[PDB]
Amino acid sequence: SGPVPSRARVYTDVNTHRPREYWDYESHVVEWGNQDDYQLVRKLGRGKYSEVFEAINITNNEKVVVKILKPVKKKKIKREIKILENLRGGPNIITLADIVKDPVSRTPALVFEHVNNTDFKQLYQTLTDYDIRFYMYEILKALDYCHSMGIMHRDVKPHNVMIDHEHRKLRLIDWGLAEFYHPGQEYNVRVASRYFKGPELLVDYQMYDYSLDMWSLGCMLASMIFRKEPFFHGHDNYDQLVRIAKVLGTEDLYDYIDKYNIELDPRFNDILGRHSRKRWERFVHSENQHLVSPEALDFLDKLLRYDHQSRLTAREAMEHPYFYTVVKDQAR
C-alpha cells in the first residue's frame, strides 16, 4: 500500500523557513572566473566526478586546490556550489575560495583552500584511541553544522575527511553529492559509497534525511576501532545488506521493513536468511583491543541502526560519554 512516510527528528523545516534563494540552487547565478589566475603545480588525483590538482594563485602566491569537474549536469554543479557557499565558514567545512572556467575549454573548476592531506590508509594505524575520539568529534561538528543548515552530505567516508595531523585540523570535503533536506521529498538511493550506504538506500527507501550520514559515520567508526576497513564489505548492493544483516541480525531488519511498509526486492529473501544480532566482542582481538572500550561500543551501537529515526543525531552523538575527555580537553 506504499511506504510509510518519514520526517527528520531534527532540523525538519530549516529550509522551509529560509528564503527560496537559499535552497533553490537551479536558479543560482554563478559569476565564473578565469582559470588563468591559477597555475596548476601538480596532479593530486582523478576522482569519480573530477580531477584534482595542487595549484598556485599567481596573483598572491597562495597555495590552492583546483577541482576541474568532469562533464556532468549543470544542475549538480550549481548544487555543489550553492551548498559550499551556504556552508562557507562553518566548523571543519572545506572553504570554496573561487569558481573559475578554462578560457578555452569553458570547463568548470572549483578552487579550494589548501589542506595538508594525510592519507587515511597510513593514518589509521597511527591513530590512538584518543585521536579517534578527537577526530570523530570534529567530524560531528561538521555534520551537525551542515544538518542544522538543512543539508545532508550523503557521502561520508574516510576519503572525504582531510586531516592535517600535525596541526590536528580536519575538513569534510566533496559536497558534490550533498542535497538540501525537504520534508516529504523522495531522494535518489543511488548515492554514497557502497560500504557506507545506510540500509534505507539498500532497501530503496527514498524518504531519508540527515540520519543517513550518521550511519556512514558508524561504518567509519567500526573500521577504526576494529581495524577492519571496510567493516561492511559487500560484493554488491544486495550483498552489502547481507553483510550488514550478518552483524545486526535479521530480526531488526524485518521489523524495520514492516514498520515503513517497505517493498523488499524479491532477490533479497533468497540471500538474507536468518541471523542473530552479534555482540561486538565478536570483532575484538589482540590487535584492536586497545581501541575498543564499553563507551566506544555503546556509541557505535547507537549509530548503526536499521531504523534511521532511532540513530543518534549529530548533536546527540556529541554528548555521548565516549567524547567526555575530548570535551574536557576542549575547555582550555
Ligand SMILES: O=C(O)[C@@H]1O[C@@H](O)[C@H](OS(=O)(=O)O)[C@@H](O)[C@@H]1O[C@H]1O[C@H](COS(=O)(=O)O)[C@@H](O[C@@H]2O[C@@H](C(=O)O)[C@@H](O[C@H]3O[C@H](COS(=O)(=O)O)[C@@H](O[C@@H]4O[C@@H](C(=O)O)[C@@H](O[C@H]5O[C@H](COS(=O)(=O)O)[C@@H](O[C@@H]6O[C@@H](C(=O)O)[C@@H](O[C@H]7O[C@H](COS(=O)(=O)O)[C@@H](O)[C@H](O)[C@H]7NS(=O)(=O)O)[C@H](O)[C@H]6OS(=O)(=O)O)[C@H](O)[C@H]5NS(=O)(=O)O)[C@H](O)[C@H]4OS(=O)(=O)O)[C@H](O)[C@H]3NS(=O)(=O)O)[C@H](O)[C@H]2OS(=O)(=O)O)[C@H](O)[C@H]1NS(=O)(=O)O
Ligand atoms: O560568462 C562568464 O562567466 C563571463 O563572466 C565575465 O568574465 C564576463 O562578464 S562581465 O559582465 O563581467 O563583463 C564575461 O566574459 C562572461 O559573461 C558574459 O559572456 C558569456 C559568454 O558570452 S557569449 O558570447 O557566449 O554570450 C555569457 O555566458 C554564456 O552563457 C552562460 C549561461 O548561459 O549561463 C554560460 O553558459 C554555460 O553555463 C550555462 C549555465 O550557467 S549558469 O549560470 O546557469 O550556472 C549552461 O546553460 C544551461 O544549459 C543550456 C542548454 O541546455 O544548452 C540552457 O538550458 C536551456 O535549454 C534546455 C533544453 O533542454 S532539452 O530538453 O532540449 O535538452 C532546458 O531544459 C533543461 O535541460 C534538459 C535536458 O538536459 O535534457 C532537461 O533536463 C532534465 O530534466 C527534465 C525534467 O522533465 S520532467 O519530465 O521531469 O518535467 C527531463 O525531462 C530531461 O530528460 C532531463 N535531461 S537529462 O539529460 O538529464 O535526461 C530540463 O528540461 C532542463 O534541465 S534542468 O536541469 O533545468 O531541470 C533548460 O530549462 C533551459 N534553461 S533556460 O535557462 O534557458 O530556461 C541554459 O542556458 C542553462 O540551463 S539551466 O538549467 O541552467 O537554466 C550552458 O550550457 C553553458 N555553456 S557551455 O558551453 O559551457 O556548455 C557561459 O558563461 C556562456 O556560455 S558559452 O556557450 O559561451 O560557454 C554571459 O551570459 C555573459 N554575461 S552577461 O550577463 O553580460 O550577458
